[PDB]
Amino acid sequence: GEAPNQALLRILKETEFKKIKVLGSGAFGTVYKGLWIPEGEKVKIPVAIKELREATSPKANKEILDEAYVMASVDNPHVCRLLGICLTSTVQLITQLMPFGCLLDYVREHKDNIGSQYLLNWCVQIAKGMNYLEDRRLVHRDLAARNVLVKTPQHVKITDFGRAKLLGAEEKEYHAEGGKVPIKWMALESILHRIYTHQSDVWSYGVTVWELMTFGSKPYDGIPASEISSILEKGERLPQPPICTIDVYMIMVKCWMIDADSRPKFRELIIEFSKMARDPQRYLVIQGDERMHLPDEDMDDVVDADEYLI
Amino acid sequence: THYYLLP
């Protein structure tokens, strides 16, 4: 009882974009920075290209394609968009370029210059992005600060849909078997029974917010991952970050209740944080908050992917 | 270092 996915998957030629730099590298493959020029259009689009390392199992190619499947069927201002894929002797994914990169990396290198207005704004945008995912009945299953990218300091997007699995019309929960998982971000439901729902994503939202509020601290640092299940069962949670009013921390704690029903909805999270974003100083106490402020390659035909539509 | 395989 669900609607046809009429999303368009676009196939891009090798000649159609220019690799200009290297961002990150791995055995799986490396990430390039470059410009995407669909010629005949007279436009250059800054993209992040993830070029496969041709030393790959068939199984590896697939995992990316399913993420590519997921990314192509989403259209939200706060969800990272897929531009297309290139079937070279190695399948590479072309996505919009996020110059400031990881939000987790961003808060850590700018701890000195991040104000309450920004922190609260991000919370709203992520809740907005996650809510879209709920409307499209999808579960991210890996919501973390490391998986939120920064287009501009005022605009962040959700990414990393490798573990993002969708539910059909009559589903509420569904199980997985194994593989390496982010224990510290996961609800108790998921650790004990491998059960992932939208409310399990609400948990990871609270952890993600806690990451931002602590300016990139590690949840349950020092504590081995083995003890997490046991500790949460004892009723222990993450400590209240110093800059947080009780109002903000109250909301985080709500994301961490054993009863998933008791947890807030993303639509509810948008409302509360939006309330707080109107009066940022009342809800986050940061030193020098009053004076904080935050911020190339031929760039005349440059358009950003968001302004480029099909 | 954030992804583990528990039982």
Task: Produce a short descriptive summary.
The complex is a heterodimer of chains A (310) and B (7). Chain A has 310 residues and is of the alpha+beta class.
Largest sheet data of chain A: 5 strands, antiparallel
What composes the largest sheet of chain B?
Answer: none
Strand content of chain A: 15-25%
Which range best describes the helical content of chain B: under 10%, 10-25%, 25-40%, 40-55%, 55-70% or over 70%?
under 10%
Modified residues (N6-(2-hydroxyisobutyryl)lysine) (chain A): 50
GO molecular function, one term (chain A): double-stranded DNA binding
Subcellular location (chain A): Cell membrane; Endoplasmic reticulum membrane; Golgi apparatus membrane; Nucleus membrane
Modified residues (Phosphotyrosine) (chain A): 174, 308
What do these coordinates show?
The complex is a heterodimer of chains A (310) and B (7). Chain A has helices spanning 58-72, 103-109, 116-135, 188-193, 198-213, 228-233, 246-254, 266-278, 280-283; strands spanning 17-25, 29-36, 45-52, 82-87, 91-96, 101-102, 138-139, 148-152, 155-158, 165-166, 174-175, 195-196. Chain A has 310 residues and is α+β, with helices and mostly antiparallel strands. Chain A has a five-stranded antiparallel sheet, with helices on one face. In chain A, strands 6-8-9 form a three-stranded antiparallel sheet. Chain A has a two-stranded antiparallel sheet with strand order 7-10. Chain A folds into two domains: 1-97, Phosphorylase Kinase, domain 1; 98-292, Transferase(Phosphotransferase), domain 1 (Orthogonal Bundle). In chain A, helix 3 (116-135) packs antiparallel against helix 5 (198-213). By secondary structure, chain B is mostly loops. Chain B is 0% helix and 0% strand. Chain B has no helices and no strands. At the A-B interface, loops of A face loops of B.
